[PDB]
């Protein structure tokens, strides 16, 4: 039933604004003063409970914290017409940023703020009766996202233990870049995330920009579009908890089905009927077309090509008016294709889910209206190429200690760079070894 | 996150007066000091540069220091001069005499305690202190000597903060004073030890900007100081307004300086274009980036084509797409790839801010860290060695009390700075 | 032609937001005329679901 | 200090730095003895 959302730093808060806008509009949470003055669904139902708790007077409040080290973005949420929702304790803001230094966030500044966050999360976790995971949004390229995200996941992992943690993470794009020190922060972040996360969802901004250029008709996209796409993906994954359906899928089923070995937990995500309003009235959108669509690389939200690897598991979530027989026919057609390949030790490669609630349309939004959608998360060896490119860029910079004095000044030993780089190298070797066929001479 | 300003010498006080006019205009503060703005976004970060006096009023967080009150009386007589707190005006009783050693050692130590007391008093009242901002010329006398004295004292008292200086530096042809090489060399020696980040402007570059780009028939010092106030107010813009990708002085420093001595930067501001001509320019990100790299718009006499970029930063003001910024910076890096140092995979940082400067639809300020600055230091060292070998004017400084070994140390340290720039310029992967 | 200047959040997510609904207001504006609203709720004290029948 | 303005930061009971002194969320507790087992087997008359 319940899930708690933790938003960290700039990307995580900006994606959070779009997420909570969407979940409010889907449930029907409105200003108390603003009477609907119009026809509504009018059915008193428990579905809010996943995200809201009631005070008993009937006010709704959301299960989220907003964490930042610079004030400006959180002070911006405290000043809008959305101030009335969050409990003011939930909106936590520090004094000064971690200045793109992982060492500054982890050692110097986040260490002061971290105990308030754990006390707030405990106060949230005490007001639950069937908590089944945390959703975390952050980017590993910046200083506070890396350092405080690592520190907070470490503390959560000791205190809460076995409970599942699913991350939505914005990684540094392979040639678009925003800051020089991105490789160092991403390597050091990835070292902590490897040990302390149950499922990791991979995002690249260059892929979502390419997808918005090719499929949607936007010449000049901005971050609000990407965050609305992310919000749609999260709504699709959490819909299985909130509405009636033919084949439900609890969040623990993702972890059991997608992760074969405890280190192999980094997953790709894609979404099918990303379509514009002008195209939407020229075409029918049956199940088999969108099932064929989700496997094309033009549909993916991370810049990797799966034709250079092998699938290990796929989880397909269908929402809207779909019938299981059409899903079975689609999956059998996918299985026939020769350019889609599974490792020979994984014969039953697919899990299906079918939910009746169609995706919501947001008044200012850019997506079309569609009766059905499918969302995919899949585990594939192609991901090894992203790490190899980050490690090569790290090696280029680290051969001359190009920036290390900032990190050493803020409290970190030089040895820690080599340890993290060797651990990510071992993760690369794991992906090389796991994908090697266990063929036996006879 | 509040900045404290210090204005020193004639150049510093005039540029500061124009700067505080520009900042007061941007936040809608009347010349009486009353807030008269029309949106909360103006008010909600006013604390960054102003302190609040009782019932409405705002006072600007600046210290004015000079050795003869002529300039101070001129700024006090100016149109916004009344805004400044009377107790914040510090002056002596005899001039700097254009001599660094007198300004640094004799009248400096006499006045310095009252300025440090006021600066400490102002800093410790803040709930969290960001860096200091200082404007001065390096070629002068009280500017160089007392500015670097004060810089050293503030670095002793606040070593964990950031230290930022803005500095005007001598043209190779247009000297205003004969003894410029000594004062410049000693001041650069002091700054390279004490400072965290230092910005440099050539009056020659501003003259060429005005004549070629703006085609002004009769430019005045008010225009040059407006250009400087424009760049200065642009650097702090992300500190004090919302945006899609916030940035900060410390974040700029961490991304711009690869090694702690390499902290001298060039500045530019893009939507510069002369009055009258039907061409508008600046209506899109390609136009700003193309103008941004045009040497006509760069604030130093050295040209980038003789050096290589270690790092660069661009701060954009206005409502714009991140794709146009990102793809333009990628295209510029790919097309001009020989001018970017190859062992760094991406040399440009971008930042985007929602609130443009008044009267421009969009603007960008550019900060560049380029090795061609080494030619300037070589030039200063040449003129210094020519004068010093012949003892050309040294008796004034020695009569104040300096040992010649300070001059030989400062020359050696500057020569080592030139060597370090040259080695990193010609480094290779191998 | 630059009198109106929004920021990106207010332009995309909360465009219909008037200047009277933000935290900062002048000290000479009336407060009784503004309707009361200090939290978010599904219903506006609506009678269809809140009343318990007997 | 960390909160700002307070004389001193209040001590915290929920969490701790030391892993052997922190308080786990999922307390692993005991079932009552009544609700287990089989109970008496009782026969009707056919």
């Amino acid at each position: 039933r319940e899930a708690i959302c933790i938003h960290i730093g700039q990307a995580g808060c900006q994606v959070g604004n779009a997420c909570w806008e969407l979940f409010c509009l889907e449930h029907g949470i409105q200003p108390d003063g603003a009477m609907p003055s119009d026809k509504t669904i009018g059915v008193e139902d428990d579905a809010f409970n996943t995200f809201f708790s009631e005070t008993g007077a009937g006010k709704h409040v959301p299960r989220a914290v907003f964490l930042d080290l610079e004030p400006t973005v959180v002070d911006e949420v405290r000043t809008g017409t959305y101030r009335q929702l969050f409990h003011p304790e939930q909106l936590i803001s520090g004094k000064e940023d971690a200045a793109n230094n992982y060492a500054r966030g982890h050692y110097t500044i986040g260490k002061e703020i971290v105990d308030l966050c754990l006390d707030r999360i405990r106060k949230l976790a005490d007001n639950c009766t069937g908590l089944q995971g945390f959703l975390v949004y952050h980017a590993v390229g910046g200083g506070t996202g890396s350092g405080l995200g690592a520190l907070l996941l470490e503390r959560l992992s000791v205190d809460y233990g076995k409970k599942s943690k699913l991350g939505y993470t914005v990684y540094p794009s392979p040639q678009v870049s925003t800051a020089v020190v991105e490789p160092y922060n991403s390597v050091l972040s990835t070292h902590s995330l490897l040990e302390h996360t149950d499922v990791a969802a991979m995002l690249d901004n260059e892929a979502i920009y390419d997808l918005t250029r090719r499929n949607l008709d936007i010449e000049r996209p901005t971050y609000t579009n990407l965050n609305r796409l992310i919000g749609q993906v999260v709504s699709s994954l959490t819909a299985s908890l909130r509405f009636d359906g033919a084949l439900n899928v609890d969040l623990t089923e993702f972890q059991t089905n997608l992760v074969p070995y405890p280190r192999i937990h980094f997953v790709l995500t894609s979404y099918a009927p990303v379509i514009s309003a002008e195209k939407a009235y020229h075409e029918q959108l049956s199940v088999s077309e969108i099932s064929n669509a989700v496997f094309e690389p033009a549909s993916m939200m991370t810049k990797c090509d799966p034709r250079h690897g092998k699938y290990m598991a796929c989880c397909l979530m269908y929402r809207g008016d779909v019938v299981p027989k059409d899903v079975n026919a689609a999956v059998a057609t996918i299985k026939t294709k020769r350019t889609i390949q599974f490792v020979d030790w994984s014969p039953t490669g697919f899990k299906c889910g079918i939910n009746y609630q169609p995706p919501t349309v947001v008044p200012g939004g850019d997506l079309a209206k569609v009766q059905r959608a499918v969302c995919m998360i899949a585990n594939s060896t192609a991901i090894a190429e992203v790490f190899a490119r980050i490690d090569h860029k790290f090696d280029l910079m680290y051969s001359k200690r190009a920036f290390v004095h900032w990190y050493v000044g803020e409290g970190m030993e030089e040895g820690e760079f080599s340890e993290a780089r060797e651990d990510l190298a071992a993760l690369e070797k794991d992906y090389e070894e796991v994908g090697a066929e266990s063929a036996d001479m006879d | 996150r509040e900045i404290v300003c210090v204005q020193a010498g004639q150049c510093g006080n005039q540029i500061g007066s124009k700067f505080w006019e520009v900042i007061s205009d941007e936040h809608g503060v009347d010349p009486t000091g009353t807030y008269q703005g029309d949106s909360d976004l103006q008010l909600e970060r006013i604390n960054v540069y102003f302190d609040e006096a009782t019932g409405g009023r705002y006072v600007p967080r600046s210290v004015l220091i000079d050795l003869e009150p002529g300039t101070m009386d001129s700024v006090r007589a100016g149109p916004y001069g009344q805004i400044f707190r009377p107790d914040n005006f510090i002056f002596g009783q005899s001039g700097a005499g254009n001599n660094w050693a007198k300004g640094h050692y004799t009248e400096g130590a006499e006045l310095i305690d009252s300025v440090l007391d006021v600066c400490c008093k102002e800093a410790e009242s803040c709930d969290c202190l960001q860096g200091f901002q200082i404007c001065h010329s390096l070629g002068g006398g009280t500017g160089s000597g007392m500015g670097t004295l004060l810089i050293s004292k503030l670095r002793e008292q606040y070593p964990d903060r950031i230290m930022m200086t803005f500095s005007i530096i001598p043209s190779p042809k247009v000297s205003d004073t004969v003894v410029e090489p000594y004062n410049t060399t000693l001041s650069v020696h002091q700054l390279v030890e004490n400072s965290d980040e230092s910005m440099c402007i050539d009056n020659e570059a501003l003259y060429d900007i005005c004549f070629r780009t703006l085609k002004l028939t009769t430019p005045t010092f008010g225009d040059l100081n407006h250009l400087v106030s424009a760049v200065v107010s642009g650097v702090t813009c992300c500190l004090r307004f919302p945006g899609q990708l916030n940035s900060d002085l410390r974040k700029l420093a961490v991304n711009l300086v690869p090694f702690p001595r390499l902290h001298f930067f060039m500045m530019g501001f893009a939507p510069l274009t002369s009055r009258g001509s039907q061409q508008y320019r600046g209506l899109s990100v390609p136009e700003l980036t193309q103008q941004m790299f045009d040497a006509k718009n760069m604030m130093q006499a050295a040209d980038p084509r003789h050096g290589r970029y270690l790092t660069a930063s661009a701060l954009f003001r206005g409502r714009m797409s991140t794709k146009e910024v990102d793809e333009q910076m990628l295209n510029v890096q790919n097309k001009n790839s020989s001018y970017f140092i190859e062992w760094i995979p991406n040399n440009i940082k971008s930042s985007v801010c929602d609130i443009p400067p008044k009267g421009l639809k969009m603007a960008v300020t550019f900060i560049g860290n380029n090795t061609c600055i080494q030619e300037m230091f070589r030039r200063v060292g040449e003129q210094f060695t020519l004068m010093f070998r012949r003892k050309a004017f040294l008796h004034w400084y020695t009569g104040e009390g300096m040992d010649e070994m300070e001059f030989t140390e400062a020359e050696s340290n500057m020569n080592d700075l030139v060597s370090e720039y040259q080695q990193y310029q010609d480094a290779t992967i191998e | 032609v630059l009198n109106c200047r929004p920021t990106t959040y207010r332009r995309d997510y909360i465009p219909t937001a008037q200047p009277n609904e933000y935290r900062t207001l002048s000290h000479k504006t009336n407060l009784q005329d503004m309707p009361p609203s200090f939290a978010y709720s599904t219903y506006a004290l609506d009678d269809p679901r809140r009343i318990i029948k007997y | 200090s960390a909160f700002g303005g307070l004389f001193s930061d209040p001590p915290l009971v929920s969490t701790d730095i030391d892993p052997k002194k922190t308080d786990p969320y999922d307390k692993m507790d005991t079932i009552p003895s009544r609700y287990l087992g089989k109970g008496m087997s009782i026969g009707r008359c056919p």
Partner: peptide, 28 residues
């Protein structure tokens, strides 16, 4: 100086803003 930590006197601090803030209306 009385053999202490230099003849410098440190001025006090004026305000200390906290971490969590209220969302009630604020006036100019």
């Amino acid at each position: 100086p009385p053999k202490g930590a230099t003849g410098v006197w440190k001025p006090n601090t004026f305000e200390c803003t906290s971490v969590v803030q209220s969302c009630l209306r604020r006036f100019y």
